[PDB]
Amino acid sequence: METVEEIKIADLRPNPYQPRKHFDDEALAELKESVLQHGILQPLIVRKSLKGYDIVAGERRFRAAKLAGLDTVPAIVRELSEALMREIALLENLQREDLSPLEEAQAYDSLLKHLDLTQEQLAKRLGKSRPHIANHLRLLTLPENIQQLIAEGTLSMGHGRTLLGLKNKNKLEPLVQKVIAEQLNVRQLEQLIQQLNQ
Amino acid sequence: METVEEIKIADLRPNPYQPRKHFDDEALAELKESVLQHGILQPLIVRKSLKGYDIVAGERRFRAAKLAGLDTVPAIVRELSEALMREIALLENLQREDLSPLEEAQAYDSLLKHLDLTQEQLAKRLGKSRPHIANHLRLLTLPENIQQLIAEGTLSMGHGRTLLGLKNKNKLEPLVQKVIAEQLNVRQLEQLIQQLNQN
Numbered sequence: 001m002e003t004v005e006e007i008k009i010a011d012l013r014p015n016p017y018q019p020r021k022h023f024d025d026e027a028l029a030e031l032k033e034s035v036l037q038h039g040i041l042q043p044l045i046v047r048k049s050l051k052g053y054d055i056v057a058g059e060r061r062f063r064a065a066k067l068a069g070l071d072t073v074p075a076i077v078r079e080l081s082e083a084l085m086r087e088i089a090l091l092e093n094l095q096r097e098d099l100s101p102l103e104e105a106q107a108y109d110s111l112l113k114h115l116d117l118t119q120e121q122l123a124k125r126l127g128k129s130r131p132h133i134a135n136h137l138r139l140l141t142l143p144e145n146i147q148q149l150i151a152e153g154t155l156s157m158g159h160g161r162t163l164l165g166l167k168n169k170n171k172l173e174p175l176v177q178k179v180i181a182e183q184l185n186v187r188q189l190e191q192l193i194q195q196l197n198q
Numbered sequence: 199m200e201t202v203e204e205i206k207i208a209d210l211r212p213n214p215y216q217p218r219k220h221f222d223d224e225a226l227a228e229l230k231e232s233v234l235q236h237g238i239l240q241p242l243i244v245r246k247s248l249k250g251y252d253i254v255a256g257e258r259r260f261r262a263a264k265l266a267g268l269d270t271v272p273a274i275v276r277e278l279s280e281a282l283m284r285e286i287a288l289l290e291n292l293q294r295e296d297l298s299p300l301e302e303a304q305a306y307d308s309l310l311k312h313l314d315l316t317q318e319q320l321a322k323r324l325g326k327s328r329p330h331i332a333n334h335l336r337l338l339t340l341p342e343n344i345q346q347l348i349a350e351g352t353l354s355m356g357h358g359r360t361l362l363g364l365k366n367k368n369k370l371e372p373l374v375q376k377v378i379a380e381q382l383n384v385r386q387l388e389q390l391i392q393q394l395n396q397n
């Protein structure tokens with residue numbers, strides 16, 4: 001039976017097989033904020049070495065914990081060959097599916113209702129910006145069929161966002177059919193919507 | 199003392215606050231294949247119900263474990279309020295960053311060399327298709343400045359693939375400048391390359 005250990009930040013060493021080459025400061029601030037709200041929800045995977053503990057999965061969490069003022073992170077300590085460490089460094093990130101834009105928006109909407117929160121309060125609680133939450137919730141004001149098209153992938157989310165800018169909704173559904181039939185890009189749609197609006 | 203328990207598949211209940219509405223069969227097969235190679239690497243998070251356990255994070259792992267024929271999954275049992283369960287069901291998915299196409303491609307290249315595997319063998323080891331691996335490795339044949347655009351997300355991986363189809367490499371930089379300024383999609387880039395390749 002494995003345990004989750006609290007490992008001191010001073011004892012942690014970089015992932016020797018780190019596949020991430022860029023650490024976005026904005027995204028780390030989001031993770032920091034979430035850690036301040038909920039703590040680290042997911043234990044790191046680490047491997048005990050002579051000098052300390054090498055991270056196998058969790059470098060962002062580690063950086064977020066430091067930003068948040070924590071002195072330890074939760075971790076599962078495993079004995080692993082170099083080959084397993086190389087594989088798992090990738091697989092922990094590779095073998096997962098993110099939520100779609102619409103699944104995210106529906107989640108925000110469900111939390112607003114069941115947690116009884118404003119969008120500002122939800123952004124704080126989730127560690128996301130207020131514009132990020134508002135832009136996703138706006139997708140839920142599009143016609144049902146267009147939401148379906150976006151989910152099915154027949155329309156991009158970028159098209160969805162651009163469609164919100166249309167003044168006269170009488171042209172909305174013909175505009176979507178044109179986008180699809182002509183495989184228009186988002187910039188072409190922006191330009192059509194500007195004229196229609198004017 | 200938080201522990202990882204092996205919990206019987208039969209005792210697990212679906213996530214009451216599941217944000218995922220689409221469970222792609224192809225992606226579940228990939229996860230199943232990875233579970234067969236490595237086991238479940240990340241414990242599920244669950245909460246005790248009146249009987250059994252509700253999944254708080256891990257429904258895809260749960261379904262892949264059924265497809266792989268497992269009897270139990272590793273799980274951390276936590277006491278959580280309803281509010282926390284609703285929050286964590288989203289957050290465990292929301293607060294994470296994917297790898298860029300180039301980071302994925304570089305990782306494959308590294309693993310091929312250091313594990314001394316062919317593309318096919320690596321594909322089996324990782325639970326991905328052989329073309330998925332091969333097609334990401336092709337990105338590494340692009341000029342570094344275009345690789346960077348793909349790394350940053352200014353160009354999509356599909357743009358990258360399509361640009362490989364260009365015969366005259368002297369037209370690459372002007373073509374990319376056009377793609378970016380005019381925000382062209384993959385199909386429109388295909389057509390421009392179609393024309394450039396016909397002399």
Ligand SMILES: Nc1ccn([C@@H]2O[C@H](COP(=O)(O)OP(=O)(O)O)[C@@H](O)[C@H]2O)c(=O)n1
Binds near residue numbers: 098233259
């Ligand atoms: N052999 C593997 C491959 C991936 N994983 C992890 O499975 C999780 C899949 O994430 P997900 O959001 O797509 O699906 P859920 O299982 O959380 O519903 C990730 O946290 C992977 O790191 C694992 O535990 N074992």
Ligand SMILES: Nc1ccn([C@@H]2O[C@H](COP(=O)(O)OP(=O)(O)O)[C@@H](O)[C@H]2O)c(=O)n1
Binds near residue numbers: 031038042057289
């Ligand atoms: N408050 C939070 C928010 C996210 N997380 C998890 O932090 C992990 C971040 O994944 P990542 O691949 O972006 O970064 P790493 O920390 O694995 O380097 C994810 O598994 C989130 O579920 C957490 O442990 N605590």
Ligand SMILES: [Ca+2]
Binds near residue numbers: 015018055057
């Ligand atoms: Ca890591």
Ligand SMILES: [Ca+2]
Binds near residue numbers: 057093
């Ligand atoms: Ca990770």
Ligand SMILES: [Ca+2]
Binds near residue numbers: 216254255257258
């Ligand atoms: Ca889940």
Ligand SMILES: [Ca+2]
Binds near residue numbers: 255256290291
């Ligand atoms: Ca998940």
